[PDB]
Amino acid sequence: GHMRLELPVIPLRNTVILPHTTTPVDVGRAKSKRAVEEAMGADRLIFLVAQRDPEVDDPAPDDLYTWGVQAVVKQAMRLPDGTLQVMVEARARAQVTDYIPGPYLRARGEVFSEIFPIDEAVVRVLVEELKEAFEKYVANHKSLRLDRYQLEAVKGTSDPAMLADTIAYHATWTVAEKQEILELTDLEARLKKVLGLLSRDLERFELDKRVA
């Protein structure tokens, strides 16, 4: 089973947040600011969930993907425009299913841990494959540029779940693609999916290089 938490929800217009990342979320909507205030009132805990359609201004629960993350609001400060900049530390995958009627989005959702890697030796091999593929991916990417610290961090990650999520964070993949990664709670399947996307992209980059 999984812990079930009742938290406010921030709907993300066109981004997917992965666990093991700390990122700024700029929110302009009143209901989103309300959700942040409510999360501050109860240990900073919040759910973040991508919208299916970035154009929806006041999403119903149904307008949001099922999978998101449970996070901690580490900081929230106003920018010069009304904008609230929220620093979110994403901690865990969440299946955010059961919403509560009210003046902002609030839901009960199941939060997932990682469990011990099951086939440990297979997972260790996939970790090595992922690190090698990621180095090539960044080296051959025509738009994405990581500094030495970001690359070092991926190479130096020994936690397979953190590795896969960090790669997925950096990679230029669509909302749908990152949602597919979020929903893979099985570690081996998640590692293989991320490896698969990297490998496909490496082949695509070679094709784009030829045709240009």
Numbering used by the authors: -1 to 210
Text lifted from the article:
Based on the result, we also crystallized and solved the structure of the longer N-terminal fragment NN291. The structure of NN291, refined to 1.7 Å resolution, is very similar to that of NN206 except for a longer C-terminal helix by four more residues, that is, residues 207–210. Despite the lack of spontaneous proteolytic fragmentation in the crystals, no electron density was seen past residue A210. (D) The refined 2Fo-Fc electron density map around the C-terminal residue A210 of NN291, contoured at 1.0 σ. Nonetheless, NN243 exhibited extra intense and poorly dispersed cross-peaks around 7.5–8.5 ppm along the proton dimension that is indicative of a highly disordered peptide segment, which most likely corresponds to the C-terminal extension of NN243. Together, our crystallographic and NMR analyses suggest that the NTD of MtaLonA forms a bilobal globular structure (residues 1–206) followed by a C-terminal flexible extension (residues 211–243). Our crystallographic results of NN206 and NN291 are consistent with previous findings that the ~40 residue region between the NTD and ATPase–Protease domains is structurally flexible with multiple accessible protease sites. We further applied multidimensional heteronuclear NMR experiments to assign the observed cross-peaks in 1H–15N TROSY-HSQC spectrum of NN206 (BMRB code: 50697) and the NMR-derived secondary structure of NN206, based on the Chemical Shift Index, was highly similar to its solved X-ray structures. Together, these results suggested that in a MtaLonA complex, each of the six NTDs may connect to the hexameric core by a flexible ~40-residue linker.
